[PDB]
């Protein structure tokens, strides 16, 4: 019972190039598909990108997206959402 | 980085100095409860020595260990020679104060103790 997704990423670093690509490519489509889902884009400086996904009764998971490409990031995103 | 040492080259020699000091203390302990009429038992005294030794176990620096040995020797002198008193020795057990409870709730309920 997923309740929230939150991507944490960086800028001007390789680790987050795939995540920026994902954001430009497929984020509007994801939102319009499931609009009532909270997707929290959160960028900072000198982090290692992660995707914290939070389920119903107070649990959540995470996966490092460092040195990952846009297609792999979309793979992990769909894995989580599924 | 590189340093200048004090009374030791490595933690092994430091630990053997420590063990000599523990021999001395452990052996002397009962003479104190005899000379000065303490209420506590030799078991309590020895447990206290062990506690005060293990309180500084994480230490790694031979110098920080040699200084603790020095200070323990000073204390043992003050004790075997009757310069300390019942008061100074019983200042180790804290018989007249309750400790800060190690419970978030027991703290919150009374004060801002974090």
């Amino acid at each position: 019972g997923l309740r929230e997704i939150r991507v944490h990423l960086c800028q001007r670093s390789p680790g987050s190039q795939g995540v920026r690509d994902f954001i430009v490519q497929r984020y509007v489509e994801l939102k319009k598909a499931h609009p009532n889902l909270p997707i929290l884009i959160r960028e900072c400086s000198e982090v290692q990108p992660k995707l914290w996904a939070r389920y119903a009764f107070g649990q959540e998971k995470t996966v490092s997206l460092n040195n990952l490409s846009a297609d792999e990031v979309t793979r992990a995103m769909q894995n989580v959402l599924s | 980085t590189s340093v200048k040492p004090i009374f030791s080259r490595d933690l092994n020699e430091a630990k053997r100095r420590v063990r000599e000091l523990y021999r001395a203390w452990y052996r002397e302990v009962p003479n104190t409860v005899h000379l000065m009429q303490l209420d506590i038992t030799v078991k309590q005294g020895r447990d206290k020595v062990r506690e005060m030794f293990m309180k500084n176990a994480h230490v790694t620096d031979p110098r920080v260990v040699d200084l603790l040995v020095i200070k323990g020797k000073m204390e043992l002198q003050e004790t075997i020679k009757v310069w300390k008193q019942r008061t100074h020795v019983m200042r180790f057990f804290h018989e007249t104060e309750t400790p800060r409870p190690k419970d978030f709730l027991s703290k919150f309920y009374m004060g801002h103790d974090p």
């Binding site: - | 590189s2 040492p5 230490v59 620096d61 800060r100 801002h112």
Partner: protein
């Protein structure tokens, strides 16, 4: 005659300070802000280390300010953030650090108060 000990430095077991006041604390390293009341800057030149404040209650007898923290009036002065932080680490205190907020250089032109075209023109001399 020299030894090598590269491990982090600690003197906590020699300071004699207790656990309650060596782990339950939070120290602050900063430069004291200038008092906007005065325009002197001979106080924003040395770094200072202070502690977190604690309970300060009222005596029932006379109304005075009573405490139990013996490090409430403890303030230390340093000439360098590196030395301040080294001392903090040495002693074993969790520290927050602030940066030296220096004012910006400003362009001043007494002639700007009399321009023929600009808004900087002043209405009272």
């Amino acid at each position: 005659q020299l030894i090598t000990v590269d491990e982090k430095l600690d003197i906590t077991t020699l300071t004699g300070v207790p656990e309650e006041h060596i782990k339950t604390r939070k120290v602050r390293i900063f430069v004291p802000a200038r008092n906007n009341m005065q325009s002197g800057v001979n106080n924003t030149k040395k770094w200072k280390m202070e502690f977190d404040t604690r309970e300060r209650w009222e005596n029932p007898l006379m109304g005075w300010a009573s405490t139990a923290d013996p490090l409430s009036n403890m303030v230390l002065t340093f000439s360098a953030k590196e030395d301040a932080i080294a001392f903090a680490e040495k002693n074993g205190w969790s520290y927050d650090v602030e940066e030296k907020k220096v004012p910006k250089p400003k362009s001043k032109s007494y002639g700007a108060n009399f321009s023929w075209n600009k808004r900087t023109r002043v209405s009272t001399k």
